[PDB]
């Protein structure tokens, strides 16, 4: 798939992703905070369509992500990110996608997510997160 | 004076400031790096005119600031930043302004300047710097 | 269990843990690096015995942990850490314990693990990791 790397920012205001309940995560885009103003991240898009979009609008800065979880597994022979859930100090968004395969979870005891990178082909192949104090 | 706070970024590409050889630093503006692309900081301008502009265009990222120095002292009764010099791993830019008063200097042995904040009235009243790895 | 918190250091030299292939992780102790010299962390001991000890001696600083993975699940009604595995840039140590239950994994793309905290009763109840640049 096509690699993407948003780099690091001040915080997160909004996550726009899409998913298919028979396959996996598709599109991924983030509106970051940058020193108190929104910064609109590039739209990272799947090679294909048929996905369901969801907008995750956080009440930044009082609301922030405290755990990211989901599943990885094979779709059409490819290891991909099948589902994602975002837990904030206020509520849980998701899970979006297919909740099967190998679970993963990243609880954050101290710190903040401030950036995303990864790769998307037909589906989100993988992703990583920037963390800071 | 009017306070300003650019916040923090990935690095520094360019500094545009102005000075007067009888008073102090006037205008101050920075083009930051933000994850590989320029981010144009707000122009922070003196209340008055008569300054001489200088453009400090750094060869980012191979060229970066390793020491900031200058002078503070009283002008028309106000404590202000009277001169600034920026030393990089390649060259020295400055001093600009009046090299009289109390010297200060910040050498950076490990780390990077990634942001500026301060206040400007007739002259640059004060400033601080964001530091990171 | 009895909570522990080693805090943060400058790196990791050795991990001493024990496990039982029928239950979970028991004892846990770390020899940290502290500014170039070993710092011997406190022994955190299970309430019971019968564990198999293992010594993970890293080639510090050339060798460092790049992923920690494991399993959590219930033993005698308690949610505990049932297995741990430590992957470095050189080799894999483990898994130790019982690889049953919910998997977790923390790959580090940039940065270092420099500390552990957690709790141990009969077995390791939970743990967290300090991360830094």
């Amino acid at each position: 798939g096509k690699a993407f790397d948003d780099g690091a920012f001040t915080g997160i205001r909004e996550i726009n992703l899409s998913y298919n309940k028979e396959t996996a995560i598709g599109d991924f885009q983030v509106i970051y905070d940058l020193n108190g103003s929104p910064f609109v991240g590039q739209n990272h898009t799947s090679f294909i369509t048929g996905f369901t979009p969801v907008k995750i609008s956080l009440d930044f800065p009082s609301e922030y992500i405290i755990e990211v979880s989901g599943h990885t597994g094979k779709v059409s022979g490819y290891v991909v990110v099948r589902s994602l859930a975002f837990k904030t100090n206020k509520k849980t968004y998701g899970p979006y996608g297919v909740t099967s395969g190998t679970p993963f979870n990243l609880p954050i005891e101290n710190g903040l997510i401030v950036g995303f990178k990864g790769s998307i082909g037909y589906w989100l192949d993988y992703f990583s997160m920037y963390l800071s104090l | 004076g009017k306070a300003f706070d650019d916040g923090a970024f990935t690095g520094i590409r360019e500094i545009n400031l102005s000075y007067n050889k009888e008073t102090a630093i006037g205008d101050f503006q920075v083009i930051y790096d933000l994850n590989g692309s320029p981010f144009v900081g707000q122009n922070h301008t003196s209340f008055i005119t008569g300054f001489t502009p200088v453009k400090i265009s750094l060869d980012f990222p191979s060229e970066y600031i390793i020491e900031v120095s200058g002078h503070t002292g009283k002008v028309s009764g106000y404590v202000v930043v009277r001169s600034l010099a920026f030393k990089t791993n390649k060259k020295t830019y400055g001093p600009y302004g009046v090299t009289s008063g109390t010297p200060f200097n910040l050498p950076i042995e490990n780390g990077l300047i990634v942001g500026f904040k301060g206040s400007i009235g007739y002259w640059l009243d004060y400033f601080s710097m964001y530091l990171s790895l | 269990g009895k909570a522990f918190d080693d805090g943060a250091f400058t790196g990791i030299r050795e991990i001493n843990l024990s496990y039982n292939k029928e239950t979970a992780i028991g004892d846990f102790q770390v020899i940290y690096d502290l500014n170039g010299s070993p710092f011997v962390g406190q022994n955190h001991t299970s309430f019971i015995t019968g564990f198999t000890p293992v010594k993970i001696s890293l080639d510090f600083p050339s060798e460092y942990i790049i992923e920690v993975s494991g399993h959590t699940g219930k033993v005698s009604g308690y949610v505990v850490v049932r297995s741990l595995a430590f992957k470095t840039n050189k080799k894999t140590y483990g898994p130790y314990g019982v690889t049953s239950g919910t998997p977790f994994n923390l790959p580090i793309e940039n940065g270092l693990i420099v500390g552990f905290k957690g709790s141990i009763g009969y077995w390791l109840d939970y743990f967290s990791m300090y991360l830094s640049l």
Partner: peptide, 17 residues
């Protein structure tokens, strides 16, 4: 020194490449 700020990155989760 790279001239660019660094931050901790965790991951990746998903395909390993």
């Amino acid at each position: 020194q790279s001239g660019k700020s660094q931050t901790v990155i965790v991951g990746p989760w998903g395909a390993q490449v």
